[PDB]
Design a protein around this nucleic acid. Structure first.
Ligand SMILES: Cc1cn([C@H]2C=C[C@@H](COP(=O)(O)OP(=O)(O)OP(=O)(O)O)O2)c(=O)[nH]c1=O
Ligand SMILES: [Mg+2]
Ligand SMILES: [Mg+2]
Lengths: 412, 555
DNA sequence: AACGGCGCCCGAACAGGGACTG
DNA sequence: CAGTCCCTGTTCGGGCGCCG
């Protein structure tokens, strides 16, 4: 009894045609069981080869969850309907969410299955379930309702979501609620007991209308930044000062007031790397002045809502991972460091997967966007393992880089 | 008035703004004329082909060819112009079934649907877009023109439509027989079960009649009731499988198209025959772009071809997959960037073999290539068995630990154990993490002129040692590598080297042991001879130490 | 002389970043 | 500051194998 909101692709773009990648046995068996129930409930329908569109599908398990969740890689379809969920029916981003003491993320994607999808658009939601050893051809489906993981789903459901959350927002005017993709971000300054109590009250508001029982908690007020720091040694060698000048010279691309004159004078000649060089009176003054500039904020660095976020990650070794978020080069909106994540000292791909998920979560809370990642990994290595460790209901854009560490800029 | 078949039609459209095919016929031999007039007449009585008139302004040529070890003819329409104007279909065939993925089945039956494409109907509103005339005489009778009521062989939509229609017909039968495995590839159906031979034929007959309700015939000509079953080009036995006999051509003179077929058969044979190499053979297919050009076999390509023929002498076979046992993948290094592997569950009972000999990157090492081989095997194992095997790798745990913890990119290998079978994979040198006390410090630099391609390369040390070497036909990057090579040549066993070349530093830090660059290979040879090497980087043109001094010499 | 699927090894065309020159 | 070069990377199309 609901009129389907008309959805159109961006002008001059066809639907997604992305090949399905091989799935493990446990994931195929999970997707066959999930899709059989969804088909019995009318959420999806089987289709034929006359539909030239296709989107990859796999399954994940969220943190501390033993239940399989279907996950569609709608990244290609999302950026082909970008004028819809950003221009027509956009969701405003609250600047106070990042200031809250506690923020709980609730999976509300199951609510989208109650709204029908535009018949003229259902063909673009096509996905294919593979078979082991290619026993049977692909089993193709398309969505009859709003699909999870499609940016158009929260946009169309937003009118429905506002009416459901209206009594709770009136009951609690201080609580900030943000919706992104299949998730609901609920932030409050209440105590941990009061917060979790108010979260359960919000769950009951949704029940009176399969992952609603979970609640991933965040604390953006505890989120830290990793600035550029300079070493502090009792004695300095030629090699130490060469690395310092190399670091400060690269850092001058960000802070224009950094000088290296008095420090380069210490290296006059052709000296051995291990020769100890005592810092002169001017070198102490110049190095002290440079340590203060690195504490001062960078001039003219602010967020532009019309520009894409970019995230670079560096593998620092020993479980250490540094990252920077920016829109323009050397205009970092945020820099951070992660240490001792899951897979530390044993699995780089799991740690990198964890780091990408953390960075994306922070970007959704702070700006309401997911950044495009520059991943320090080979394409074939990432594409072999990343789905094994993915625990999020969204997927960010990424590319693959290879930058040897000439200077340890973000972690000495 | 043609009857509508029980198989649900597939709605096929065309690309907007385009019409149907209008291509003139091709003059063929009189042998093809007497081999197609009888087909269009038999298919007309059976309802597979209807006759049209002048109200269909389309035409498409069609030739024919013989079959595989048979006496029947294959009608292949040349719909290349129709395919350019027909809508795109998403292929549901995602790969090729491999016998190493089949599980143990007590009873096995292989079927083959007769007239596969000719038993599935075409879209009602699309039959008009398939017009073609048939002249009885090459230059006399104009010939009555017909159309297609089924799937033509040669149309780009015929495979996808048949594979999807066949699945919908089998879906109810598979739901009624869950314990029966049906491998469905095109028209051939692999049916297996753990039932007794008597009860197995019962369900086979039930399946043959189930398919008969939609017009799909399973004749006794290609019905296989006893091993060895010929399925997907393999010989399937109750407890083992092998590839059908592979014949390698043995010509006295070798050209280009002969080697392309030779390397192709060796790639197909390497799935069960361990230790097949095609490096030196494929190396002959470089540069020359004349398929009909004779190429003499080099001494390396001749010995490589001789060792492959001796592997194919002894008969080999693979086993089937037992999900109750683990998957094991063991890799060996064959040298020269060549890797071979075996996947098994019980020792010396290979499910399948294979090779990885891809050379990616101008500079690399054995640890990087071993990582790439592990990834290729992992993805291959997920396609065939849906799981990753435990690996047995010829690399020490300590070697791997040193590499991945120190590398700047993320890299990883799944659960694996060390197998002590030489040649072991190791890192041939390790750059120091700190400058070396007591080692001479070399400040290297190189510059070249963009126009004359002339350049200099040299160094300056803390002990006063100095060198400048003029170079001809070089680049800035080559002189930077040459400067480092000079420092390694003229230093002791322990040396500190300071450069401003991000290019040169990035190559050496990745610890390559092989390179397409002779200069890098010479650098690698020097790095192995050393006991301690510390590479440091400084920014150029900043008046930093000896780097400023050596910059004046080479520029 | 046809269609689709997968794999390999090949080369041409392309993109992207340090570094030099006007 | 642009416009090149040098160098290295990926993408893709065709050669071949094999299946139907
Ligand atoms: C071998 C082959 C096959 N096909 C298509 C057509 C029917 C299916 C199966 O072909 P087939 O089994 O060999 O012949 P088929 O038409 O089924 O007739 P039968 O020989 O089984 O009686 O794939 C094709 O288009 N080109 C080919 O070269
Ligand atoms: Mg057949
Ligand atoms: Mg230099």
């Amino acid at each position: 009894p609901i009129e389907t909101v008309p959805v159109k692709l961006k002008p001059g773009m066809d639907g997604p045609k992305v090949k399905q990648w091989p799935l493990t046995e446990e994931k195929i068996k999970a997707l066959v069981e999930i899709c059989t129930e969804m088909e019995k409930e009318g959420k999806i329908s089987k289709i034929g080869p006359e539909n030239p569109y296709n989107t990859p599908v796999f399954a994940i398990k969220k943190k501390d969850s033993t239940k399989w969740r279907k996950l569609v890689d709608f990244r290609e379809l999302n950026k082909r309907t970008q004028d819809f969920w950003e221009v027509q029916l956009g969701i405003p981003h609250p600047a106070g969410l990042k200031k809250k003491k506690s923020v709980t993320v609730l999976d509300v994607g199951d609510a989208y299955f109650s709204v029908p999808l535009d018949e003229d658009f259902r063909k673009y939601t096509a996905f294919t379930i593979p078979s082991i050893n290619n026993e049977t051809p692909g089993i193709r489906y398309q969505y009859n309702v709003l699909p999870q993981g499609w940016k158009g789903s929260p946009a169309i459901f937003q009118s429905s979501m506002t009416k459901i959350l209206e009594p709770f927002k009136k009951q609690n005017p201080d609580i900030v609620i943000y919706q992104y993709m299949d998730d609901l971000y609920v932030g409050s300054d209440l105590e941990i007991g009061q917060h979790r109590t108010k979260i359960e009250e919000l769950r009951q508001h949704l029940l009176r209308w399969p992952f609603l029982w979970m609640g991933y908690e965040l604390h953006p007020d505890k989120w830290t930044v990793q600035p550029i720091v300079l070493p502090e040694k009792d004695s300095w060698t030629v090699n130490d000062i060469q690395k310092l000048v190399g670091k400060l010279n690269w850092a001058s691309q960000i802070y224009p007031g950094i000088k290296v004159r008095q420090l380069s004078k210490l290296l006059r000649g052709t000296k051995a790397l291990t020769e100890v060089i005592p810092l002169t009176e001017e070198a102490e003054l110049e190095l002290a002045e440079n340590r203060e500039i690195l504490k001062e904020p960078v001039h003219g660095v602010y967020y532009d809502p019309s520009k894409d976020l970019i995230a670079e990650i560096q593998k620092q070794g020993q479980g250490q991972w540094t990252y920077q978020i920016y829109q323009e080069p050397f205009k970092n909106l945020k820099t951070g460091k992660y240490a001792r994540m899951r897979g530390a000292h044993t699995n780089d791909v799991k740690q990198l997967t964890e780091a990408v998920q953390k960075i994306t979560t922070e970007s959704i809370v702070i700006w309401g966007k997911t950044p495009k990642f520059k991943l320090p990994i080979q394409k074939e290595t990432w594409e072999t393992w990343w789905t094994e460790y993915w625990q999020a209901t969204w997927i960010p854009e990424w590319e693959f880089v290879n930058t040897p560490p000439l200077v340890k800029l973000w972690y000495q | 008035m043609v009857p509508i078949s029980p198989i649900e039609t597939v709605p096929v459209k065309l690309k907007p703004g385009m019409d149907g095919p209008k291509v003139k016929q091709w003059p063929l031999t009189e042998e093809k004329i007497k081999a197609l007039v009888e087909i269009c007449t038999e298919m007309e009585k059976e309802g597979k082909i209807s006759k049209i008139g002048p109200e269909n302004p389309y035409n498409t040529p069609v030739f024919a060819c013989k079959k595989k070890d048979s006496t029947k003819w294959r009608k292949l329409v040349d719909f290349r112009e129709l395919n350019k104007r027909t809508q795109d279909f998403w292929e549901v065939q995602l790969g090729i079934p491999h016998p190493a993925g089949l599980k143990k089945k007590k009873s096995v039956t292989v079927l083959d649907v007769g007239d596969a494409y000719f038993s599935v109907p075409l879209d009602e509103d699309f039959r008009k877009y398939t017009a073609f005339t048939i002249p009885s005489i090459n230059n006399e009778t104009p010939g009555i023109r017909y159309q297609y009521n089924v799937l033509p062989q040669g149309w780009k939509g015929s495979p996808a439509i048949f594979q999807s229609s066949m699945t919908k017909i089998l879906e109810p039968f598979k739901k009624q027989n869950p314990d029966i495995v049906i491998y469905q590839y095109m028209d051939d159906l692999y049916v297996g079960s753990d039932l007794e031979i008597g009860q197995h034929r019962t369900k086979i007959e039930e399946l043959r009649q189930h398919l008969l309700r939609w017009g799909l015939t399973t004749p006794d000509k290609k019905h296989q009731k006893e091993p060895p079953f010929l399925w997907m080009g393999y010989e399937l036995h109750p407890d083992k499988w092998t590839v059908q006999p592979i014949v390698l051509p043995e010509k006295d003179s070798w050209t280009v198209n002969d080697i392309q077929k030779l390397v192709g058969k060796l790639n197909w044979a390497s799935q069960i025959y361990p230790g097949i190499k095609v490096r030196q053979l494929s190396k002959l297919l470089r540069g020359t772009k004349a398929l009909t050009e004779v190429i003499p076999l080099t001494e390396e390509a001749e010995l490589e071809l001789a060792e492959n023929r001796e592997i194919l002498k002894e008969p080999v076979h693979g086993v089937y997959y037992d999900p109750s046992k683990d998957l094991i993948a063991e890799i060996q290094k064959q040298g020269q960037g060549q890797w071979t592997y075996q996947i098994y569950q019980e020792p010396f009972k290979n499910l399948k073999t294979g090779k990885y000999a891809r050379m990616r990157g101008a500079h690399t090492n054995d640890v990087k290539q071993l990582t790439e081989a592990v990834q290729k095997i992992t993805t291959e194992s997920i396609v065939i068995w849906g799981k990753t095997p435990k690996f047995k790798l010829p690399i020490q745990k300590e070697t791997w630990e040193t590499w991945w913890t120190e590398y700047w990119q993320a890299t990883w290998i799944p659960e694996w154990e060390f197998v002590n079978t030489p040649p072991l994979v190791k890192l041939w040198y390790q750059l120091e993490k700190e400058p070396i006390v007591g080692a001479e410090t070399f400040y290297v630099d190189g510059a070249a002129n963009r126009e004359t391609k002339l350049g200099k390369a040299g160094y300056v040390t803390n002990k006063g040692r100095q060198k400048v070497v003029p170079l001809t036909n070089t680049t800035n990057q080559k002189t930077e590598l040459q400067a480092i090579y000079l420092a390694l040549q003229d230093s002791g066993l322990e040396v500190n080297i300071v450069t401003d070349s991000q290019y040169a530093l990035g190559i050496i830090q990745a610890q390559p042991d092989k390179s397409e660059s002779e200069l890098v290979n010479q650098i690698i040879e020097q790095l192995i001879k050393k006991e301690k090497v510390y590479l440091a980087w400084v920014p150029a043109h900043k008046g930093i130490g000896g780097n400023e001094q050596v910059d004046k010499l080479v520029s």
